[PDB]
Design a protein around this ligand. Structure first.
Ligand code: NI
Length: 247
């Protein structure tokens, strides 16, 4: 990984030492990016419901993961399942129960810094992973995209700024997540995100996460070409809000 400072460095250290998993996957890769494209065809607002009990931003909730995934199976374009343990309270069991029970696309959200972690997603039943430009070297990014591509997964590559975009495009990314939050500091900038989004080739599938709770915020973002929306906190707190966001 890159040399990092502070909480991010700590989590990348946790992550290098994370025990891998052994399981045979008993389900297909259901492609998150294609389904998002499919919901653009039908003009259905395409929302990735995130399941996370905790965030470094101070969310701290208990709720049943299986009931949540099931409720979201009906309206979500896919699910994002936090598996990082220390800062998000996630776990691989959560992903495994979640993947066993629904048949919409599932993304594994963690801090992937080694191949066995992508192996962990596949064996647990996730259909794709998030990669962070910001914690990987360019050679690690490229080869971890190649490695996820080899289980037939198109990874979601997170960019926070323009230098991230240049590295992402160069390494071949076609599925890009644009974060308003910078993870190393927790600097939130929604104007920086808007600029960044206009620079992305028309040919990449674009996912946006702010801290989205409002329908107008989704609408603005769609106008700029954003294909799908990663929404966590507000749906952790009121799942049924999803209905009003999809309408
Ligand atoms: Ni991130």
């Amino acid at each position: 990984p890159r040399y990092l400072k502070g909480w991010l460095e700590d989590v990348v250290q946790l992550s290098l030492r994370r025990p891998s998993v052994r399981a045979s996957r008993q389900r297909p890769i259901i492609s998150l990016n294609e389904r998002i494209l499919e919901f653009n065809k039908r003009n259905i607002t395409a929302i990735i419901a995130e399941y996370k009990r905790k965030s470094p931003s101070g969310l701290d909730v208990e709720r049943d993961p299986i009931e949540y995934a099931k409720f979201m199976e009906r309206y979500a374009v896919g699910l994002s399942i936090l598996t990082e343990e220390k800062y998000f309270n996630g776990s691989y069991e959560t992903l495994r129960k979640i993947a066993s029970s629904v048949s919409i696309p599932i993304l594994m959200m963690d801090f992937i810094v080694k191949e066995s972690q992508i192996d962990d997603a596949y064996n647990l039943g996730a259909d794709t992973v998030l990669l962070a430009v910001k914690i990987l070297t360019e050679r690690e990014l490229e080869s971890l995209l190649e490695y996820a591509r080899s289980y037939g997964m198109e990874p979601l590559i997170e960019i926070t700024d323009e230098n991230d975009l240049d590295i992402a495009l160069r390494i071949g990314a076609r599925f890009i997540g644009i974060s308003s939050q910078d993870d190393e500091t927790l600097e939130i900038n929604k104007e920086n995100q808007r600029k960044l989004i206009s620079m992305i080739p028309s040919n990449v599938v674009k996912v946006a996460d702010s801290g989205i709770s409002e329908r107008n915020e989704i609408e603005e973002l769609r106008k700029l070409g954003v294909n799908a929306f990663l929404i966590g906190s507000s749906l952790m707190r009121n799942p049924e809000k999803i209905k009003e966001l999809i309408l």
